[PDB]
Design an enzyme around this catalytic site. Structure first.
Site, short mmCIF file in Angstrom:
data_model
loop_
_atom_site.label_atom_id
_atom_site.label_comp_id
_atom_site.label_asym_id
_atom_site.label_seq_id
_atom_site.Cartn_x
_atom_site.Cartn_y
_atom_site.Cartn_z
N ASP A 1 8.31 1.32 9.95
CA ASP A 1 8.15 -0.10 9.68
C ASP A 1 8.96 -0.83 10.76
O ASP A 1 9.54 -0.13 11.58
CB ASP A 1 8.56 -0.49 8.26
CG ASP A 1 7.70 -1.71 7.92
OD1 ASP A 1 7.74 -2.74 8.62
OD2 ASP A 1 6.95 -1.64 6.94
N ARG B 1 -12.27 -9.79 7.46
CA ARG B 1 -11.45 -8.78 8.14
C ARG B 1 -11.39 -8.99 9.66
O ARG B 1 -10.36 -8.71 10.28
CB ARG B 1 -11.89 -7.37 7.74
CG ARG B 1 -11.66 -7.07 6.27
CD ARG B 1 -11.87 -5.62 5.88
NE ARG B 1 -12.14 -5.35 4.48
CZ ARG B 1 -13.03 -5.71 3.59
NH1 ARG B 1 -14.01 -6.54 3.88
NH2 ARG B 1 -13.00 -5.29 2.32
N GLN C 1 -0.09 2.60 19.02
CA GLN C 1 0.10 3.73 18.12
C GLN C 1 -0.77 4.90 18.57
O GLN C 1 -0.29 6.03 18.60
CB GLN C 1 -0.14 3.35 16.65
CG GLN C 1 1.06 2.61 16.07
CD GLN C 1 0.86 2.04 14.69
OE1 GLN C 1 -0.20 2.19 14.10
NE2 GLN C 1 1.91 1.39 14.19
N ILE D 1 0.84 -1.19 0.00
CA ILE D 1 0.00 0.00 0.00
C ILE D 1 0.87 1.24 0.00
O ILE D 1 0.73 2.12 -0.86
CB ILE D 1 -0.87 0.00 1.28
CG1 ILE D 1 -1.80 -1.20 1.21
CG2 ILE D 1 -1.64 1.30 1.50
CD1 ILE D 1 -2.63 -1.38 2.47
N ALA D 2 1.80 1.37 0.94
CA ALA D 2 2.76 2.46 0.98
C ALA D 2 3.53 2.52 -0.35
O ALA D 2 3.54 3.61 -0.96
CB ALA D 2 3.78 2.40 2.10
N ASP E 1 -14.30 1.52 -0.56
CA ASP E 1 -15.62 0.92 -0.79
C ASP E 1 -16.48 1.95 -1.54
O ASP E 1 -17.26 1.59 -2.40
CB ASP E 1 -16.35 0.54 0.48
CG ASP E 1 -15.58 -0.27 1.49
OD1 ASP E 1 -15.03 -1.34 1.11
OD2 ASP E 1 -15.52 0.12 2.68
N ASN F 1 -4.10 -7.30 15.30
CA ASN F 1 -3.88 -5.90 14.90
C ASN F 1 -4.32 -4.85 15.88
O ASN F 1 -3.63 -3.83 16.07
CB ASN F 1 -4.55 -5.78 13.52
CG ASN F 1 -3.65 -6.31 12.42
OD1 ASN F 1 -2.43 -6.50 12.53
ND2 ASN F 1 -4.27 -6.52 11.26
N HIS G 1 -16.23 -1.17 7.58
CA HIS G 1 -15.41 -1.50 6.41
C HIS G 1 -15.27 -3.02 6.41
O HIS G 1 -14.28 -3.59 6.88
CB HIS G 1 -14.02 -0.80 6.51
CG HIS G 1 -13.19 -1.22 5.34
ND1 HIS G 1 -13.72 -1.10 4.06
CD2 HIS G 1 -11.98 -1.81 5.23
CE1 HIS G 1 -12.85 -1.56 3.20
NE2 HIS G 1 -11.81 -2.01 3.89
#
Ligand SMILES: NC(=O)c1ccc[n+]([C@@H]2O[C@H](COP(=O)([O-])OP(=O)(O)OC[C@H]3O[C@@H](n4cnc5c(N)ncnc54)[C@H](O)[C@@H]3O)[C@@H](O)[C@H]2O)c1
Ligand SMILES: NC(=O)c1ccc[n+]([C@@H]2O[C@H](COP(=O)([O-])OP(=O)(O)OC[C@H]3O[C@@H](n4cnc5c(N)ncnc54)[C@H](O)[C@@H]3O)[C@@H](O)[C@H]2O)c1
Ligand SMILES: O=C(O)C(=O)C(=O)O
Lengths: 333, 333
Positions: A41, A97, A111, A15-16, A158, A104, A186
């Site tokens: 990272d 998901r 964070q 993605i990055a 989406d 996660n 999502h």
């Protein structure tokens, strides 16, 4: 203008890799707006980061004032204006998901705690890693000194996916479709609502239902297509979406930074406190909003039919379930 | 206001994944130029190719009128206005991107043949896949009805890297550097020449030899650094240099499409017939050109010093050799 400090986590991932070029070229924050780019990272990916830095230098990007590659939270989150939280374990073919949640959610708690400690209070935080809404909610609640409103998660992909299915159905352009809404989570219970959507036909601008003239499709195949879209890409590619994910992140952050256009709202996962649509408070639910001066506001007065009532309630219910699991797990230790 | 038909071969891998968004974005052919992207890959990669197709649609790009995915040469090459030839066999560490000649030139022999029969006669063909120069040449030789001038390969990445190195050395921006030249082959004998190049240093254009004041570096480390750059990104990333390659391919194709800026020439491999630089005829070698109305023109009258002469000659010898090796194989049968 003084440079803005923009962090992108999981910066050595896909993605990055599909997104840094668009930030550095000025197509996101502004052609004249300098960027201090921060790239987080894990330790073993720092050599990949260095390859990405040489490629940024080889792309001719003068708006990149500085590019900081790090594996430290202290450095990564210091003084940010923007936080793009991608860093996450991706799901694979066969997973919803929802597994990734325990794996996660712990990352987003730390964070959120790192933002709260080191970033500016004005930071805009964009959560992409899965489950985005719950991840979103957890990070937000570990940052009590940062307004709830600065926390958003991505349903723009989406949204864009829903427009592309309408354009393809009617043989129209993506920009001729507008005001499609992505309600709730999502995930596969997302409600891609075209009740208030507009399509530009050659004779006049009409409602999506009126132009399609296929209610079953709009409430059937159209809903499933958009909902399963992420799973279909992974099934084909064997990798999560990235090109399309990065582009929607660009559209989401640009709409935050520059506002939405006259007569138009975009889909955004935000805190649900005070909504008028019959959705519990304290959820990170995706709503149709209008943005101005970087501040979002949910669109009010949208007539909700029966079919849309149900759907909207099913995503909220699913979101409560994920809220229960992540909070049991993070307190338990 | 009608669309153009663009082919991208090797659409299922790395370079194309970083490049297709920029084609359907309007940043290559223009913001009002509608495109129909034709994606070609081999049979085993059709699964992956359909997921890239889904991603493309999901970016919701107003200009992207249609996207087609095939493994058929008769479909890929039909009525193309532009063909980008990326598909081929790969490289990596252990040196130099030499040996690939015989394992990639068959691909391009076939591909020229399809352009010949299916493609518009006016097609512009950009060859990227390695051996870029020799694959280029083979495709033009197997497509005798399409003008030899319509064929070109990519030295724009080496050219772009060179500018960044000069910018880095001096402490200036990459776009402050004009008129570097990549002479020869896209390989380790390439000659990145700065004798005719300019830099804006402290608001005054000067001469990169004049600005750098370190002739040894320009004839030594700068040259090797530019020649070894691709291998340094790949050893750091463990993946191709796709983001920077995607950008150089857009540079190359945009300059073809809209022409070079006034006072500026760019590097691009082309057919050598008739040059006045002492390079053998019937070679696909990189020269400095000016472009107007989609037609390149080698920049005549540049004085060639002795250092430059053995370097341009050295690159030529290598290219002569690859020509031998490629043609004996293909004619052998
Ligand atoms: N909301 C959306 O529409 C959306 C769309 C696509 C992908 N995603 C999600 O985004 C996430 C990112 O993964 P991806 O698709 O780029 O694949 P990826 O695995 O290639 O990239 C993930 C990167 O995160 C890094 N990372 C992992 N843990 C980290 C940590 N604690 N701190 C910092 N970096 C860390 C990895 O090393 C890697 O470089 C996944 O969860 C994916 O499912 C969300
Ligand atoms: N000239 C330059 O500056 C430059 C720079 C970088 C890379 N390259 C070259 O570009 C090429 C692409 O690299 P990549 O990173 O995308 O590699 P990759 O492995 O990711 O992709 C190559 C693709 O080519 C496909 N392919 C193979 N044979 C084919 C055929 N006959 N027809 C159609 N498709 C075919 C493969 O299936 C694959 O999908 C390589 O040759 C690479 O060395 C050139
Ligand atoms: O694959 C996924 O989990 C996504 O969120 C996506 O690609 O949008």
């Amino acid at each position: 203008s003084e440079p803005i400090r923009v962090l992108v986590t999981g910066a050595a991932g896909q993605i990055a890799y599909s997104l840094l070029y668009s930030i550095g070229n000025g197509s996101v924050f502004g052609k004249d707006q300098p960027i201090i780019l921060v790239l987080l990272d894990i330790t073993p990916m720092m050599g990949v980061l260095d390859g990405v830095l040489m490629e940024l230098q080889d792309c001719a990007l003068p708006l990149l004032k500085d590019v900081i590659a790090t594996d430290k939270e202290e450095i990564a989150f210091k003084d940010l204006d923007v936080a793009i939280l991608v860093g996450s374990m991706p799901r694979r073919d066969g997973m919803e998901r929802k597994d990734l949640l325990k794996a996660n959610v712990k990352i987003f708690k730390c964070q959120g705690a790192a933002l709260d400690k080191y970033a500016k209070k004005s930071v805009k935080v964009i959560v992409v890693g899965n489950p985005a809404n719950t991840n979103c909610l957890t990070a937000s609640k570990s940052a009590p000194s940062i307004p709830k409103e600065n926390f958003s998660c991505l349903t723009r992909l989406d949204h864009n996916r829903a427009k592309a299915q309408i354009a393809l159905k009617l043989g129209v352009t993506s920009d001729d479709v507008k005001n499609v809404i992505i309600w709730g989570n999502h995930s596969s219970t997302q409600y891609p609502d075209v009740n208030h959507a507009k399509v530009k036909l050659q004779a006049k601008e009409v409602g999506v239902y009126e132009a399609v003239k296929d209610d079953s499709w709009l409430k059937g195949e159209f809903i499933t297509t958009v909902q399963q879209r992420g799973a279909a890409v992974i099934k084909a590619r064997k990798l999560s979406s990235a090109m399309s994910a990065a582009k929607a992140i660009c559209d989401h952050v640009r709409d935050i930074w520059f506002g939405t256009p006259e007569g138009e709202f975009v889909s955004m996962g935000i805190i649900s406190d005070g909504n008028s649509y019959g959705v519990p408070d304290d959820l990170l639910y995706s709503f149709p909003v209008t943005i101005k001066d970087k501040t979002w506001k949910i669109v009010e007065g949208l007539p909700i039919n029966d079919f849309s009532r149900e759907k909207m309630d099913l995503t909220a219910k699913e979101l409560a379930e994920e809220k229960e699991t992540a909070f049991e797990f993070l307190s338990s230790a």
